[PDB]
Amino acid sequence: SNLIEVFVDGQSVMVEPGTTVLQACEKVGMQIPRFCYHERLSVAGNCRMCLVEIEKAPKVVAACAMPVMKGWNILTNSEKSKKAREGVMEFLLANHPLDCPICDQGGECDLQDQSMMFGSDRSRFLEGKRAVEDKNIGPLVKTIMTRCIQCTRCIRFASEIAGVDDLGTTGRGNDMQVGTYIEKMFMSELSGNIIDICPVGALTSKPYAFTARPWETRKTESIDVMDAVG
Amino acid sequence: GAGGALFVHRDTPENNPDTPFDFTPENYKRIEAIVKNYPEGHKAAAVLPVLDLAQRQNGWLPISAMNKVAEILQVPPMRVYEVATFYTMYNRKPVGKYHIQVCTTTPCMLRNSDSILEAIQKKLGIKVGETTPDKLFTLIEVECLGACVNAPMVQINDNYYEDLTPKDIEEIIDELKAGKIPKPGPRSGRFSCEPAGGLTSLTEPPKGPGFGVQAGL
Amino acid sequence: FDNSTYRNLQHHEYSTYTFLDLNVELSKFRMPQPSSGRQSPRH
Amino acid sequence: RFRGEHALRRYPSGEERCIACKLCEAVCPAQAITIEAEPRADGSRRTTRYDIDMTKCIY
Amino acid sequence: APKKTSFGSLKDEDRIFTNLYGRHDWRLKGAQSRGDWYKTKEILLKGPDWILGEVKTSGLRGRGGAGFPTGLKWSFMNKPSDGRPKYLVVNADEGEPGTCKDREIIRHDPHKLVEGCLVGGRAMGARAAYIYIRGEFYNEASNLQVAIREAYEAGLIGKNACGSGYDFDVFVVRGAGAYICGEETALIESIEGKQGKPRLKPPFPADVGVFGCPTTVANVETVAVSPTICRRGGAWFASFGRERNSGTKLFNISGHVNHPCTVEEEMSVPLKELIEKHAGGVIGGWDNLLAVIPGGSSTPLIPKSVCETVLMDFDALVQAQTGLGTAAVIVMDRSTDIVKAIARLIEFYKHESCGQCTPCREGVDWMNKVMARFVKGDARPAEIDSLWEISKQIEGHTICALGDGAAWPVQGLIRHFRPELEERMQQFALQHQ
Ligand SMILES: NC(=O)C1=CN([C@@H]2O[C@H](COP(=O)(O)OP(=O)(O)OC[C@H]3O[C@@H](n4cnc5c(N)ncnc54)[C@H](O)[C@@H]3O)[C@@H](O)[C@H]2O)C=CC1
Ligand SMILES: Cc1cc2nc3c(=O)[nH]c(=O)nc-3n(C[C@H](O)[C@H](O)[C@H](O)COP(=O)(O)O)c2cc1C
Ligand code: SF4
Ligand code: SF4
Ligand code: SF4
Ligand code: SF4
Ligand code: FES
Numbered sequence: 014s015n016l017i018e019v020f021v022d023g024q025s026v027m028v029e030p031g032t033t034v035l036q037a038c039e040k041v042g043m044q045i046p047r048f049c050y051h052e053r054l055s056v057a058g059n060c061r062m063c064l065v066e067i068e069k070a071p072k073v074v075a076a077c078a079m080p081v082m083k084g085w086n087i088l089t090n091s092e093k094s095k096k097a098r099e100g101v102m103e104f105l106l107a108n109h110p111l112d113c114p115i116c117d118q119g120g121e122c123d124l125q126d127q128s129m130m131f132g133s134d135r136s137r138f139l140e141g142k143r144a145v146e147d148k149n150i151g152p153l154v155k156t157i158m159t160r161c162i163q164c165t166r167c168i169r170f171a172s173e174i175a176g177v178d179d180l181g182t183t184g185r186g187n188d189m190q191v192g193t194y195i196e197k198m199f200m201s202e203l204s205g206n207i208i209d210i211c212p213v214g215a216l217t218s219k220p221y222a223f224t225a226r227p228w229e230t231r232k233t234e235s236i237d238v239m240d241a242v243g
Numbered sequence: 244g245a246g247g248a249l250f251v252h253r254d255t256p257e258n259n260p261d262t263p264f265d266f267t268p269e270n271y272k273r274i275e276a277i278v279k280n281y282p283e284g285h286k287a288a289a290v291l292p293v294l295d296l297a298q299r300q301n302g303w304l305p306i307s308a309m310n311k312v313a314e315i316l317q318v319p320p321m322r323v324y325e326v327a328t329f330y331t332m333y334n335r336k337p338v339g340k341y342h343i344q345v346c347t348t349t350p351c352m353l354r355n356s357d358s359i360l361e362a363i364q365k366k367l368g369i370k371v372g373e374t375t376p377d378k379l380f381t382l383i384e385v386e387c388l389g390a391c392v393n394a395p396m397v398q399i400n401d402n403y404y405e406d407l408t409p410k411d412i413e414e415i416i417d418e419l420k421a422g423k424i425p426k427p428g429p430r431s432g433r434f435s436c437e438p439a440g441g442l443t444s445l446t447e448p449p450k451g452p453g454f455g456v457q458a459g460l
Numbered sequence: 461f462d463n464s465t466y467r468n469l470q471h472h473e474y475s476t477y478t479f480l481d482l483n484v485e486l487s488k489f490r491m492p493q494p495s496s497g498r499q500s501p502r503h
Numbered sequence: 504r505f506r507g508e509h510a511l512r513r514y515p516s517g518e519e520r521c522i523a524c525k526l527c528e529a530v531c532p533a534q535a536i537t538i539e540a541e542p543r544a545d546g547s548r549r550t551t552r553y554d555i556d557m558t559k560c561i562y
Numbered sequence: 563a564p565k566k567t568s569f570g571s572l573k574d575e576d577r578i579f580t581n582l583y584g585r586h587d588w589r590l591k592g593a594q595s596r597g598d599w600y601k602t603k604e605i606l607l608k609g610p611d612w613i614l615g616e617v618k619t620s621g622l623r624g625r626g627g628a629g630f631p632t633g634l635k636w637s638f639m640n641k642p643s644d645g646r647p648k649y650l651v652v653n654a655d656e657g658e659p660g661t662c663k664d665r666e667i668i669r670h671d672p673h674k675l676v677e678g679c680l681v682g683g684r685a686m687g688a689r690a691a692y693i694y695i696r697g698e699f700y701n702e703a704s705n706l707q708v709a710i711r712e713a714y715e716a717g718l719i720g721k722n723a724c725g726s727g728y729d730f731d732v733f734v735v736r737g738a739g740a741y742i743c744g745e746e747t748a749l750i751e752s753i754e755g756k757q758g759k760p761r762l763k764p765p766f767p768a769d770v771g772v773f774g775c776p777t778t779v780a781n782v783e784t785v786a787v788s789p790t791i792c793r794r795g796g797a798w799f800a801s802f803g804r805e806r807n808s809g810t811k812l813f814n815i816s817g818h819v820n821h822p823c824t825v826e827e828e829m830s831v832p833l834k835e836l837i838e839k840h841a842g843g844v845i846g847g848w849d850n851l852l853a854v855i856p857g858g859s860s861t862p863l864i865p866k867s868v869c870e871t872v873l874m875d876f877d878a879l880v881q882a883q884t885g886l887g888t889a890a891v892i893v894m895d896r897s898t899d900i901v902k903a904i905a906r907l908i909e910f911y912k913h914e915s916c917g918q919c920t921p922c923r924e925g926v927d928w929m930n931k932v933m934a935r936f937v938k939g940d941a942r943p944a945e946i947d948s949l950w951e952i953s954k955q956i957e958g959h960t961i962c963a964l965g966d967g968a969a970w971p972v973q974g975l976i977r978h979f980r981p982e983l984e985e986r987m988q989q990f991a992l993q994h995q
């Protein structure tokens with residue numbers, strides 16, 4: 014019908030108009046690295062981890078936000094894509110705190126795993142790190158904002174899914190901080206979900222703190238009975 | 244270097260949600276005119292001017308002023324806080340009667356803006372980013388103000404004073420604290436962006452309406 | 461005719477509300493604004 | 504470098520060094536280490552259980 | 563002799579901004595005396611296609627600094643209406659260090675800007691014009707508002723602009739201290755009451771712009787030269803400069819010159835001729851020249867050896883690896899600490915970054931710290947290469963071009979003054995054991 018033909022590493026794919034590069038990549042089983050993109054949230058495009066090279070194009074594009082075009086050949090594993098990933102990971106890790114042994118995210122961290130799979134294995138950052146003050150948003154979500162990478166997933170979830178506009182960014186530049194700018198509890202019937210969407214240990218569960226590691230746990234898939242939603 | 248100003252608000256006896264603030268009726272009329280400049284479905288676009296108006300009435304922006312602006316425009320308060328912390332012209336703390344801003348970027352730095360900064364510091368006896376005990380004068384360093392041709396330059400209360408020497412800024416401060424209004428602009432017999440001597444361009448009289456209009460028009 | 465004096469002295473007499481007073485004065489000269497069909501994106 | 508009987512160490516202040524990261528528990532080839540942890544009364548990340556079975560350990 | 567090869571001397575009769583120095587009345591009467599608002603009704607009734615064709619045949623390129631062809635960019639908005647209103651947004655943020663031209667345009671002949679707004683809106687089929695003026699230019703904004711008021715009472719704008727039957731408004735919106743708000747998408751976001759954070763492209767402003775409507779963001783110089791181009795023809799504008807570098811240009815010469823100033827000159831004028839003719843020459847003589855930043859802080863600097871024969875247009879400066887930018891010439895003589903100047907520029911960019919995207923937000927701060935250490939000499943020579951790579955990791959990887967504008971100056975400094983950095987590190991090591 015209206016399907017257009019693109020190429021992922023030379024493999025032809027038929028996609029609907031408006032499909033992004035990331036979704037076209039997903040169709041053939043290739044997952045593009047991401048930090049700010051969530052498939053149930055608005056497209057942000059700020060983390061820049063999803064940069065990929067289009068054949069015969071000099072500038073890499075943000076796969077999460079760029080619609081595909083007819084005849085495009087997406088090169089997911091080229092030198093340009095890998096160098097972009099390494100540079101973005103280096104910038105992400107320059108100011109990140111050395112907190113993994115005391116961070117509850119350790120073992121199920123997207124930052125850790127994508128650094129292992131797409132980043133470099135060492136550092137050349139020879140400066141001091143930034144440190145930001147912590148915020149209190151209630152007894153449910155523990156907050157350690159030095160680990161924040163400014164993906165704005167929590168803000169987008171709060172505005173779009175929960176309907177609460179209490180979260181935002183204050184300042185600018187390297188000093189931009191995610192928070193409420195005042196002492197205010199982010200209290201919602203769906204607030205705890207921002208623990209799951211947060212890719213790092215910036216937001217964690219307070220009742221769960223320090224009790225377990227992800228590789229220890231045994232998972233049982235079952236149903237909730239606290240209401241009739243199931 | 245470091246900003247030095249926090250982006251977290253902590254309630255204080257002189258800065259809390261119950262601090263009194265309200266627009267005057269004249270300022271309410273001005274707000275109405277401001278809001279009438281945007282499409283009917285987009286009233287948040289008036290956040291930047293109205294907030295500015297509040298500061299022009301108060302001198303600075305307490306959290307009460309931000310809450311009032313958010314209530315007036317039906318915008319959530321966090322958006323107003325975001326705008327107030329993003330833009331550097333907003334004062335989230337009281338400042339002196341005259342806010343002195345010295346451009347220190349490379350074009351002005353090349354023409355010895357350090358002498359102007361040192362002269363201001365010596366005359367007022369205060370560090371950059373500090374407000375005098377009297378409170379009339381507040382001093383800060385700003386980035387390029389768009390007058391690099393006339394350097395070194397200073398901005399005081401949205402007035403531009405250009406081609407400054409230490410004596411010039413000393414006299415400006417003296418007549419500012421004496422209750423007089425100094426003449427804004429350059430202080431080298433120049434009064435614009437022309438060359439200091441000669442007027443190398445635009446000496447012949449300008450020509451009329453139909454000088455070089457094409458045919459068939 | 462002469463290129464002697466400077467013709468931009470009027471801005472010496474500008475106060476804190478001049479811009480918004482001019483906006484108020486121009487308020488009556490505009491055309492009716494277009495509408496998106498809502499009161500706000502949250503309506 | 505000799506490897507002998509196990510011990511848990513402190514900082515010079517007397518505070519325990521262990522912060523219950525469970526890296527030793529994860530890496531132990533004999534599964535000889537058992538760790539349980541919780542926030543302390545002062546909010547610190549410390550263990551409530553640190554067991555080593557020396558008849559399982561391979562040193 | 564067709565196809566002129568030496569440029570840089572145009573007389574006053576061929577200058578567009580005849581009141582650049584504010585020696586004549588900036589009000590409506592003076593503007594009409596100098597040819598403003600003349601036969602605008604006929605130009606409006608010539609139709610948008612005629613105006614777009616005149617702008618295209620004129621060879622005018624974007625005076626904001628990117629040099630995009632103006633006719634094609636304006637014709638991107640020549641689509642049929644779909645229900646949404648159409649807008650023209652005039653960029654008057656003027657954040658680039660060294661640049662002062664738009665301030666003089668706004669304060670000394672705002673009627674040129676207003677008439678250009680009307681003509682551009684007619685060409686694009688725009689309902690109204692929004693002028694985003696820098697928040698620090700309070701008196702300039704007030705002058706612009708007074709000129710707009712005079713135009714409104716004269717019938718030149720508003721209901722039935724002139725006698726063309728075209729309705730058009732002009733609004734002035736002031737910023738609040740943000741350099742990033744000069745970027746077109748960040749400017750649109752700031753107009754809508756949000757933080758000045760650029761949005762990704764596509765979509766381009768012609769599809770989804772201010773209030774989600776089709777809009778065009780144009781520099782004030784580009785808008786202000788358009789009515790003159792329409793009146794005198796595109797051929798007259800294209801007669802000046804080299805091919806694909808047509809027209810006249812405003813230049814702001816600042817730094818270590820005897821007479822820093824702002825002038826109007828033909829495009830392809832050589833840099834040395836401009837400096838020694840309009841700026842009084844370099845302080846201490848031409849042999850005292852160390853380096854020149856030709857197009858504002860975002861352009862790479864060039865040493866004295868390149869400035870001997872380089873011309874001031876887009877193509878020649880691109881071949882010199884420096885770009886034309888805003889045509890803001892900053893001159894540094896041999897008494898200048900070049901490392902300190904570049905570090906100050908990097909500090910400016912660190913203070914102006916909006917923080918949205920990772921490469922700018924982290925890497926610009928990183929390079930600021932590295933250059934601060936370079937100024938003293940603490941670093942080791944290997945770090946220089948590291949710094950280069952860091953800049954390469956920022957350029958081309960960010961949402962907007964601020965990251966490029968921060969990466970390029972350090973690239974130029976390393977390209978042309980590496981021995982200075984190396985000897986500074988040597989002296990620091992030798993002084994501190
Ligand atoms: N005037 C000033 O104060 C300042 C100027 N600048 C200059 O800005 C330049 C870079 O700015 P950018 O906007 O990022 O350059 P750009 O090339 O990305 O865009 C320039 C214009 O061309 C349009 N355009 C480009 N490609 C298009 C396409 N495929 N379709 C539709 N429209 C298209 C864009 O809409 C935009 O308005 C720099 O060279 C710098 O010199 C930078 C800072 C301050
Ligand atoms: C960080 C940044 C700041 C900018 N600031 C301005 C500015 O202050 N004024 C301006 O005219 N253009 C500025 N620009 C360039 C704009 O993109 C330009 O104005 C816009 O493309 C208008 O195009 P034009 O030059 O064809 O008119 C800036 C660009 C960037 C990346
Ligand atoms: S968030 Fe991830 S990378 Fe950061 S300290 Fe925690 S586990 Fe380590
Ligand atoms: S707190 Fe977590 S989800 Fe929110 S912006 Fe920071 S890293 Fe992203
Ligand atoms: S849990 Fe094991 S590895 Fe972690 S700090 Fe304690 S003793 Fe060391
Ligand atoms: S490059 Fe810098 S200014 Fe531009 S969007 Fe990214 S962080 Fe913001
Ligand atoms: S995932 Fe695309 S920019 Fe973040």
Ligand code: FES
Nearest residue numbers: 346351387388390
């Ligand atoms: S560098 Fe000082 S006004 Fe621009």
Ligand SMILES: [Mg+2]
Nearest residue numbers: 208211213216
């Ligand atoms: Mg998390």
